[PDB]
């Protein structure tokens, strides 16, 4: 008995494994005594945007593009009292193969073995 | 008895496994004594946008594009009292193969073995 | 007895497995004593948008596009009292193959083995 | 006895499995004593939009497009008292093959083995 | 009995494994006694943007681009009282193969061994 084996393998198989975890902990409070006197509370916030004849990517192609043109983002800016943000903003971006990618697996093997017994 | 095997494998099979978890913890409160006096509460917020003759991507193609033109985003900005945000904003973006991708697996093997016994 | 096997496999089979979980925890409150005096509560919010002759993607094709033209998004901005957001906004975007993708599996094998016993 | 087998397999079969779960936890309250005095409550909110001669995607095709033209979204902005949002907004978008995709499996094998015993 | 094996392997399979974890710790408070007197609270914030005839990437292609054009980002700037940010902003960007990448695996082996016994 004989064993002849030729597993020709042209394979592309990348892969990622991830463990993600958050615990807010222990928030314990005993005998918290409070006397609060705050009359006449008057907070102010003004947000303004104006734009005229803008343009973006006015030319030839981009293979991949995550970037922006003139924009405005506002987050958690003016918290006044007892404001909690716990594990608040979790942003995960995972890409195996990006945009505009060419995979051309051009496999044309020739294999002619023999066994004489 | 003989064994001849040639599992020619032209295969593309990438893959991701993920564990995601959040626990708000323990929020315990005993004998919290409070006396609050806050007459005449007058908070203010003004948000304004104006735009005229804008344009975006006025040209040739983009393989892939997540970016924006002039926009405005407002989040959790003016919390006044007892405001909690726990594991609030979770954004996951997972792509195996992006846009505008070409996979051309052109497999034309030739294989003629033999066994003489 | 002999064994000859050639499982020629031109296969594309990527795949993702995910575990997602949230627990709000333990929110326990004992002997919480409160005396609240808040007459004359007058909060204000104004949101304004105006747009004139805008345009977007006024050209050749996009393979894939998630981006926007001038828009406005407002979230959880002005919470006044006892406002809770727990595991509130969960956004998952999963794509195996994006838009404008070409898979051309052009498999034309030739295989003529033989066994002489 | 002999075994000859050639399972030529040109197959595309990607697939995703997902576990999704939320538990609001334990919300326990004992001996909560409250005396609330809030006469003359007058909250205000104004939301305004105007648009004139807008246009979107005024050109050649898009393979796939999830993006918008000038719009406005308002969510959970002005909660005044005892407002709870638990696992409130869950948005899942899962695509195996996007729009404008071409799968051309052009399989024309030739296979003529033989066994002489 | 003899063993002949030639597993010719032209394979590209990179992969990353990650452990991510946060614990807010222990936040314990006993006999916290407070007397607060803060009448006439008047905070102010003004945010302004104006833009005219801007442009971005007005030329030939970019293989990959994450960069922006003139934008403005505001975060956690003006917290007034009792403001907590715990494991607040977690941003992970993982790419195996970037955009505009060419993988051309052009495998054309020739292999004709033999065994005479
Ligand atoms: C971490 O992930 C591995 C697999 O990568 C798994 O065996 C283990 O259970 C995970 N541990 C935790 C604490 O999530
Ligand atoms: C982590 O994921 C692995 C598989 O990747 C699984 O065995 C395990 O149960 C998971 N553990 C937790 C704590 O989620
Ligand atoms: C995690 O997922 C694996 C499969 O990926 C499964 O065996 C296990 O039950 C899951 N565990 C939890 C805690 O969800
Ligand atoms: C997780 O999913 C696996 C299959 O993916 C299943 O065996 C298991 O029951 C699930 N566990 C939970 C806790 O949902
Ligand atoms: C760390 O990850 C390894 C696999 O990379 C796993 O065995 C282990 O459980 C993880 N440990 C923790 C504490 O997450």
XYZ file of C-alpha atoms and ligand atoms in Angstrom:
655
model
C 0.000 0.000 0.000
C 1.188 3.497 -0.946
C 0.077 7.077 -0.293
C 0.454 9.847 -2.910
C -1.150 13.217 -2.140
C -0.714 16.701 -3.658
C -3.257 19.181 -2.212
C -2.337 22.176 -4.378
C -3.940 25.072 -2.490
C -4.180 28.582 -3.888
C -6.203 30.117 -1.059
C -6.744 33.601 0.387
C -8.538 33.382 3.793
C -7.601 36.119 6.303
C -9.654 36.482 9.498
C -9.929 38.463 12.785
C -11.289 37.424 16.226
C -12.148 40.033 18.887
C -13.194 40.192 22.591
C -14.786 43.533 23.634
C -16.038 44.260 27.203
C -17.018 47.148 29.594
C -18.134 47.101 33.258
C -19.381 50.331 34.841
C -17.967 49.255 38.204
C -19.571 49.743 41.614
C -21.293 53.080 42.284
C -22.266 52.964 45.980
C -23.460 55.934 48.020
C -24.424 55.964 51.715
C -25.688 58.836 53.903
C -25.269 61.434 51.144
C -26.834 64.565 52.683
C -27.568 67.505 50.413
C -29.123 70.971 50.740
C -29.164 72.762 47.396
C -30.258 76.368 46.804
C -29.858 77.529 43.159
C -32.534 80.043 42.091
C -32.376 81.845 38.733
C -30.519 79.368 36.477
C -30.084 80.823 32.925
C -27.701 78.840 30.616
C -27.131 79.797 26.937
C -25.854 78.033 23.759
C -25.788 79.306 20.126
C -24.674 77.194 17.129
C -24.429 78.709 13.611
C -23.412 77.489 10.108
C -23.473 79.111 6.657
C -22.077 77.743 3.382
C -21.988 79.007 -0.236
C -21.002 77.236 -3.546
C -18.866 74.429 -2.012
C -17.523 71.433 -3.929
C -15.838 68.095 -3.161
C -13.795 65.524 -5.111
C -14.274 67.401 -8.409
C -11.821 65.263 -10.388
C -10.713 61.721 -11.176
C -11.542 58.644 -9.095
C -10.615 57.721 -5.533
C -9.868 54.085 -4.765
C -11.271 54.492 -1.240
C -12.300 57.663 0.650
C -13.622 58.170 4.215
C -12.800 61.923 4.398
C -15.267 64.834 4.441
C -15.963 68.301 3.058
C -16.697 71.198 5.379
C -19.000 69.908 8.140
C -19.498 70.499 11.875
C -19.910 67.975 14.737
C -20.952 68.843 18.323
C -20.855 66.295 21.182
C -21.466 66.393 24.973
C -20.342 70.013 25.072
C -22.497 71.736 27.736
C -23.602 69.351 30.522
C -24.885 71.409 33.446
C -25.561 69.050 36.362
C -25.308 65.328 37.244
C -24.326 64.284 33.680
C -22.839 60.777 33.194
C -21.287 59.296 30.006
C -20.202 55.653 30.663
C -18.759 53.597 27.763
C -20.834 56.084 25.821
C -19.338 56.239 22.302
C -17.806 53.038 20.937
C -16.955 53.185 17.221
C -15.428 50.108 15.523
C -14.526 50.081 11.804
C -13.232 46.720 10.488
C -12.382 46.086 6.801
C -10.815 42.920 5.388
C -10.447 44.147 1.783
C -10.961 47.802 0.973
C -12.691 49.332 -1.991
C -11.258 49.337 -5.471
C -9.274 46.126 -4.918
C -8.531 43.507 -7.603
C -8.005 39.860 -6.684
C -7.194 37.855 -9.833
C -6.328 34.286 -8.851
C -5.276 32.812 -12.196
C -4.462 29.207 -11.327
C -3.604 26.896 -14.235
C -1.566 23.954 -12.791
C -0.332 20.985 -14.826
C 0.408 17.787 -12.812
C 0.911 14.227 -14.198
C 2.506 11.813 -11.652
C 2.447 8.013 -11.824
C 3.099 4.937 -9.644
C 4.434 1.629 -11.056
C 4.289 -1.351 -8.671
C -4.513 -0.972 -1.722
C -3.346 2.541 -2.638
C -4.469 6.109 -1.943
C -4.117 8.908 -4.532
C -5.733 12.262 -3.720
C -5.319 15.763 -5.203
C -7.866 18.217 -3.719
C -6.970 21.239 -5.859
C -8.577 24.108 -3.932
C -8.840 27.632 -5.294
C -10.855 29.127 -2.438
C -11.405 32.593 -0.954
C -13.181 32.332 2.459
C -12.245 35.045 4.992
C -14.284 35.366 8.200
C -14.552 37.312 11.509
C -15.892 36.230 14.946
C -16.750 38.808 17.637
C -17.778 38.924 21.348
C -19.381 42.246 22.433
C -20.618 42.930 26.016
C -21.600 45.788 28.441
C -22.698 45.699 32.110
C -23.952 48.908 33.733
C -22.518 47.803 37.077
C -24.107 48.248 40.499
C -25.841 51.570 41.213
C -26.795 51.411 44.913
C -27.994 54.353 46.987
C -28.940 54.341 50.687
C -30.205 57.185 52.912
C -29.811 59.813 50.178
C -31.383 62.920 51.756
C -32.141 65.881 49.520
C -33.710 69.336 49.892
C -33.775 71.162 46.566
C -34.888 74.768 46.018
C -34.509 75.969 42.383
C -37.202 78.482 41.354
C -37.068 80.320 38.014
C -35.212 77.874 35.723
C -34.799 79.368 32.184
C -32.419 77.421 29.844
C -31.870 78.418 26.172
C -30.601 76.694 22.970
C -30.559 78.004 19.351
C -29.450 75.928 16.326
C -29.227 77.481 12.824
C -28.222 76.302 9.303
C -28.307 77.959 5.870
C -26.920 76.633 2.574
C -26.855 77.935 -1.031
C -25.876 76.203 -4.363
C -23.720 73.389 -2.869
C -22.373 70.419 -4.823
C -20.670 67.081 -4.100
C -18.625 64.539 -6.085
C -19.128 66.448 -9.362
C -16.676 64.342 -11.374
C -15.554 60.814 -12.205
C -16.360 57.712 -10.152
C -15.412 56.755 -6.604
C -14.646 53.115 -5.877
C -16.033 53.479 -2.341
C -17.067 56.626 -0.414
C -18.375 57.089 3.163
C -17.568 60.845 3.381
C -20.047 63.743 3.466
C -20.766 67.223 2.123
C -21.501 70.091 4.476
C -23.786 68.762 7.235
C -24.269 69.312 10.979
C -24.656 66.757 13.816
C -25.684 67.582 17.415
C -25.562 65.004 20.248
C -26.155 65.061 24.042
C -25.047 68.686 24.174
C -27.198 70.370 26.865
C -28.279 67.952 29.632
C -29.556 69.973 32.583
C -30.207 67.581 35.477
C -29.934 63.851 36.319
C -28.964 62.849 32.740
C -27.465 59.354 32.210
C -25.921 57.914 29.000
C -24.817 54.268 29.614
C -23.379 52.249 26.686
C -25.473 54.747 24.780
C -23.995 54.945 21.255
C -22.455 51.765 19.850
C -21.623 51.955 16.131
C -20.090 48.902 14.395
C -19.206 48.918 10.671
C -17.903 45.578 9.314
C -17.068 44.985 5.617
C -15.494 41.841 4.163
C -15.148 43.106 0.570
C -15.683 46.769 -0.199
C -17.434 48.321 -3.140
C -16.018 48.369 -6.627
C -14.016 45.161 -6.116
C -13.274 42.574 -8.831
C -12.727 38.920 -7.954
C -11.923 36.952 -11.127
C -11.036 33.376 -10.186
C -9.994 31.941 -13.552
C -9.159 28.331 -12.724
C -8.306 26.055 -15.660
C -6.247 23.107 -14.256
C -5.010 20.165 -16.327
C -4.246 16.950 -14.351
C -3.733 13.406 -15.777
C -2.116 10.974 -13.262
C -2.160 7.175 -13.475
C -1.483 4.080 -11.329
C -0.140 0.793 -12.782
C -0.259 -2.213 -10.428
C -9.027 -1.943 -3.563
C -7.877 1.584 -4.442
C -9.012 5.140 -3.699
C -8.682 7.971 -6.257
C -10.307 11.308 -5.398
C -9.914 14.828 -6.841
C -12.464 17.253 -5.317
C -11.588 20.305 -7.424
C -13.198 23.145 -5.457
C -13.480 26.683 -6.775
C -15.490 28.137 -3.894
C -16.047 31.582 -2.366
C -17.807 31.272 1.051
C -16.870 33.960 3.612
C -18.898 34.234 6.833
C -19.159 36.140 10.166
C -20.479 35.012 13.595
C -21.336 37.554 16.320
C -22.350 37.621 20.037
C -23.960 40.925 21.168
C -25.185 41.561 24.764
C -26.167 44.386 27.228
C -27.250 44.250 30.899
C -28.509 47.433 32.566
C -27.057 46.294 35.890
C -28.632 46.693 39.325
C -30.376 49.998 40.085
C -31.315 49.791 43.786
C -32.515 52.705 45.902
C -33.445 52.644 49.606
C -34.713 55.457 51.868
C -34.340 58.119 49.164
C -35.918 61.201 50.785
C -36.696 64.186 48.589
C -38.278 67.629 49.008
C -38.365 69.494 45.705
C -39.494 73.103 45.204
C -39.135 74.347 41.583
C -41.842 76.861 40.594
C -41.729 78.739 37.276
C -39.872 76.329 34.949
C -39.481 77.867 31.426
C -37.104 75.957 29.053
C -36.574 76.999 25.391
C -35.312 75.318 22.163
C -35.291 76.672 18.560
C -34.187 74.637 15.505
C -33.986 76.233 12.021
C -32.991 75.099 8.483
C -33.097 76.797 5.070
C -31.718 75.515 1.752
C -31.673 76.860 -1.838
C -30.703 75.171 -5.194
C -28.529 72.350 -3.743
C -27.179 69.408 -5.738
C -25.460 66.068 -5.061
C -23.413 63.559 -7.085
C -23.937 65.504 -10.337
C -21.486 63.432 -12.385
C -20.354 59.918 -13.261
C -21.139 56.789 -11.243
C -20.172 55.794 -7.711
C -19.389 52.148 -7.030
C -20.762 52.465 -3.485
C -21.800 55.584 -1.515
C -23.094 56.000 2.072
C -22.302 59.755 2.332
C -24.792 62.644 2.462
C -25.529 66.135 1.163
C -26.266 68.972 3.554
C -28.534 67.602 6.306
C -29.002 68.104 10.058
C -29.368 65.516 12.866
C -30.383 66.294 16.480
C -30.240 63.683 19.281
C -30.817 63.692 23.077
C -29.722 67.319 23.248
C -31.867 68.963 25.968
C -32.927 66.507 28.710
C -34.201 68.487 31.691
C -34.829 66.060 34.559
C -34.538 62.320 35.356
C -33.580 61.365 31.761
C -32.069 57.882 31.182
C -30.533 56.486 27.949
C -29.412 52.839 28.515
C -27.978 50.861 25.556
C -30.091 53.373 23.690
C -28.629 53.619 20.161
C -27.082 50.462 18.711
C -26.267 50.699 14.992
C -24.729 47.673 13.213
C -23.862 47.738 9.485
C -22.552 44.418 8.083
C -21.730 43.873 4.376
C -20.149 40.752 2.878
C -19.825 42.062 -0.701
C -20.377 45.731 -1.425
C -22.146 47.311 -4.338
C -20.745 47.406 -7.830
C -18.728 44.200 -7.366
C -17.989 41.649 -10.116
C -17.424 37.986 -9.284
C -16.626 36.059 -12.484
C -15.720 32.476 -11.589
C -14.687 31.086 -14.976
C -13.835 27.470 -14.195
C -12.984 25.232 -17.162
C -10.908 22.275 -15.801
C -9.669 19.363 -17.913
C -8.884 16.128 -15.978
C -8.364 12.604 -17.448
C -6.726 10.148 -14.970
C -6.756 6.351 -15.228
C -6.058 3.234 -13.123
C -4.708 -0.030 -14.619
C -4.805 -3.064 -12.301
C -13.667 -2.986 -5.231
C -12.524 0.551 -6.080
C -13.661 4.098 -5.298
C -13.345 6.954 -7.829
C -14.971 10.281 -6.932
C -14.588 13.817 -8.341
C -17.136 16.222 -6.784
C -16.273 19.296 -8.864
C -17.879 22.113 -6.863
C -18.171 25.664 -8.145
C -20.172 27.086 -5.243
C -20.729 30.516 -3.679
C -22.476 30.170 -0.259
C -21.532 32.835 2.326
C -23.548 33.073 5.556
C -23.800 34.946 8.908
C -25.106 33.784 12.331
C -25.957 36.297 15.085
C -26.956 36.326 18.805
C -28.567 39.615 19.975
C -29.778 40.215 23.581
C -30.756 43.015 26.076
C -31.824 42.840 29.750
C -33.082 46.005 31.453
C -31.615 44.836 34.761
C -33.179 45.199 38.204
C -34.923 48.495 39.003
C -35.848 48.250 42.706
C -37.045 51.141 44.854
C -37.960 51.042 48.560
C -39.224 53.831 50.856
C -38.866 56.520 48.177
C -40.442 59.584 49.835
C -41.232 62.588 47.669
C -42.817 66.025 48.128
C -42.919 67.923 44.844
C -44.055 71.534 44.383
C -43.712 72.815 40.773
C -46.425 75.335 39.819
C -46.329 77.246 36.519
C -44.477 74.860 34.161
C -44.101 76.433 30.653
C -41.730 74.550 28.251
C -41.216 75.629 24.598
C -39.963 73.982 21.350
C -39.957 75.372 17.759
C -38.862 73.367 14.681
C -38.676 74.998 11.212
C -37.693 73.899 7.659
C -37.814 75.631 4.263
C -36.446 74.383 0.928
C -36.417 75.764 -2.649
C -35.456 74.109 -6.025
C -33.273 71.277 -4.609
C -31.926 68.356 -6.638
C -30.200 65.013 -6.001
C -28.158 62.526 -8.057
C -28.696 64.503 -11.288
C -26.250 62.455 -13.365
C -25.116 58.951 -14.280
C -25.889 55.801 -12.289
C -24.908 54.774 -8.770
C -24.117 51.122 -8.129
C -25.478 51.402 -4.575
C -26.512 54.500 -2.572
C -27.794 54.879 1.025
C -27.006 58.633 1.318
C -29.499 61.516 1.486
C -30.246 65.019 0.223
C -30.978 67.831 2.645
C -33.233 66.431 5.392
C -33.689 66.897 9.151
C -34.040 64.279 11.935
C -35.043 65.021 15.559
C -34.885 62.383 18.334
C -35.448 62.353 22.132
C -34.357 65.980 22.334
C -36.495 67.594 25.078
C -37.542 65.110 27.801
C -38.806 67.060 30.805
C -39.421 64.603 33.653
C -39.121 60.856 34.411
C -38.175 59.938 30.803
C -36.662 56.462 30.185
C -35.136 55.101 26.933
C -34.007 51.449 27.458
C -32.582 49.503 24.476
C -34.706 52.030 22.641
C -33.257 52.313 19.110
C -31.712 49.172 17.623
C -30.910 49.447 13.903
C -29.375 46.441 12.090
C -28.521 46.543 8.359
C -27.212 43.239 6.920
C -26.404 42.731 3.204
C -24.824 39.629 1.671
C -24.515 40.973 -1.897
C -25.074 44.648 -2.582
C -26.857 46.255 -5.475
C -25.469 46.386 -8.970
C -23.447 43.178 -8.545
C -22.713 40.655 -11.323
C -22.141 36.986 -10.529
C -21.352 35.091 -13.750
C -20.437 31.500 -12.895
C -19.415 30.145 -16.298
C -18.555 26.523 -15.556
C -17.712 24.315 -18.547
C -15.628 21.349 -17.224
C -14.391 18.459 -19.369
C -13.594 15.207 -17.469
C -13.075 11.697 -18.975
C -11.424 9.221 -16.527
C -11.450 5.427 -16.822
C -10.740 2.289 -14.750
C -9.390 -0.958 -16.284
C -9.476 -4.015 -13.996
C 4.525 1.012 1.659
C 5.732 4.496 0.689
C 4.632 8.086 1.306
C 5.032 10.833 -1.331
C 3.437 14.215 -0.598
C 3.895 17.684 -2.144
C 1.355 20.185 -0.730
C 2.297 23.160 -2.918
C 0.695 26.078 -1.061
C 0.476 29.577 -2.491
C -1.555 31.143 0.315
C -2.090 34.642 1.729
C -3.901 34.458 5.128
C -2.965 37.212 7.619
C -5.034 37.609 10.801
C -5.317 39.620 14.070
C -6.699 38.615 17.513
C -7.561 41.249 20.146
C -8.624 41.443 23.845
C -10.209 44.799 24.851
C -11.476 45.561 28.408
C -12.457 48.472 30.770
C -13.591 48.461 34.428
C -14.833 51.710 35.979
C -13.440 50.656 39.357
C -15.059 51.179 42.754
C -16.771 54.528 43.387
C -17.763 54.447 47.081
C -18.956 57.438 49.088
C -19.938 57.503 52.778
C -21.202 60.398 54.936
C -20.758 62.972 52.158
C -22.319 66.121 53.661
C -23.030 69.046 51.363
C -24.574 72.519 51.654
C -24.592 74.283 48.295
C -25.669 77.888 47.667
C -25.245 79.016 44.015
C -27.906 81.531 42.912
C -27.724 83.305 39.540
C -25.865 80.801 37.313
C -25.407 82.225 33.752
C -23.021 80.213 31.472
C -22.429 81.137 27.788
C -21.143 79.341 24.631
C -21.054 80.584 20.989
C -19.934 78.443 18.014
C -19.664 79.927 14.486
C -18.635 78.672 10.998
C -18.672 80.266 7.533
C -17.264 78.866 4.277
C -17.153 80.100 0.649
C -16.158 78.296 -2.641
C -14.040 75.495 -1.073
C -12.699 72.477 -2.958
C -11.032 69.139 -2.155
C -8.988 66.543 -4.071
C -9.443 68.394 -7.389
C -6.990 66.231 -9.337
C -5.891 62.678 -10.089
C -6.742 59.621 -7.987
C -5.838 58.725 -4.413
C -5.108 55.092 -3.610
C -6.527 55.535 -0.096
C -7.552 58.726 1.762
C -8.891 59.267 5.317
C -8.056 63.019 5.472
C -10.510 65.939 5.479
C -11.186 69.398 4.062
C -11.920 72.316 6.355
C -14.243 71.059 9.115
C -14.757 71.682 12.843
C -15.193 69.186 15.725
C -16.248 70.087 19.297
C -16.177 67.562 22.179
C -16.806 67.694 25.964
C -15.668 71.312 26.039
C -17.830 73.065 28.677
C -18.959 70.708 31.478
C -20.247 72.795 34.378
C -20.946 70.465 37.311
C -20.714 66.748 38.225
C -19.717 65.671 34.675
C -18.242 62.154 34.225
C -16.680 60.640 31.059
C -15.612 56.998 31.751
C -14.163 54.913 28.876
C -16.218 57.392 26.904
C -14.705 57.511 23.390
C -13.178 54.293 22.060
C -12.308 54.406 18.346
C -10.784 51.308 16.683
C -9.864 51.246 12.968
C -8.577 47.870 11.687
C -7.711 47.201 8.010
C -6.148 44.018 6.632
C -5.758 45.212 3.018
C -6.254 48.863 2.175
C -7.964 50.374 -0.811
C -6.512 50.345 -4.284
C -4.543 47.130 -3.693
C -3.797 44.487 -6.353
C -3.291 40.845 -5.401
C -2.472 38.810 -8.528
C -1.624 35.246 -7.512
C -0.562 33.740 -10.839
C 0.235 30.140 -9.935
C 1.097 27.801 -12.820
C 3.117 24.863 -11.341
C 4.349 21.872 -13.344
C 5.068 18.690 -11.300
C 5.563 15.115 -12.655
C 7.135 12.717 -10.079
C 7.062 8.916 -10.221
C 7.691 5.856 -8.011
C 9.021 2.531 -9.388
C 8.853 -0.428 -6.980
C -11.713 35.839 24.450
O -11.812 35.298 23.166
C -11.402 33.963 23.116
C -11.329 33.629 21.649
O -10.610 34.649 21.002
C -12.384 33.118 23.933
O -11.863 31.828 24.148
C -12.644 33.705 25.323
O -13.811 33.163 25.886
C -12.802 35.226 25.334
N -12.750 35.683 26.702
C -13.485 36.699 27.195
C -13.297 37.011 28.664
O -14.258 37.345 26.507
C -16.269 34.558 23.154
O -16.372 34.031 21.865
C -15.957 32.698 21.799
C -15.889 32.379 20.328
O -15.176 33.409 19.690
C -16.930 31.841 22.612
O -16.402 30.551 22.811
C -17.187 32.411 24.009
O -18.349 31.859 24.573
C -17.350 33.931 24.036
N -17.295 34.375 25.410
C -18.032 35.382 25.917
C -17.839 35.679 27.387
O -18.811 36.031 25.240
C -20.816 33.241 21.784
O -20.922 32.729 20.490
C -20.501 31.398 20.406
C -20.439 31.098 18.932
O -19.734 32.139 18.302
C -21.467 30.528 21.213
O -20.935 29.237 21.394
C -21.721 31.080 22.618
O -22.877 30.516 23.180
C -21.891 32.599 22.663
N -21.831 33.027 24.041
C -22.569 34.025 24.565
C -22.371 34.305 26.038
O -23.354 34.679 23.898
C -25.409 31.931 20.504
O -25.519 31.431 19.204
C -25.097 30.102 19.107
C -25.039 29.817 17.629
O -24.338 30.864 17.007
C -26.059 29.223 19.909
O -25.523 27.932 20.075
C -26.308 29.762 21.320
O -27.461 29.191 21.881
C -26.479 31.279 21.381
N -26.415 31.693 22.763
C -27.153 32.685 23.298
C -26.950 32.951 24.773
O -27.941 33.344 22.641
C -7.170 37.100 25.747
O -7.264 36.550 24.468
C -6.860 35.212 24.431
C -6.781 34.865 22.967
O -6.054 35.878 22.316
C -7.848 34.378 25.250
O -7.333 33.088 25.478
C -8.114 34.977 26.634
O -9.285 34.445 27.197
C -8.265 36.499 26.630
N -8.219 36.969 27.995
C -8.952 37.990 28.477
C -8.770 38.314 29.943
O -9.718 38.633 27.780
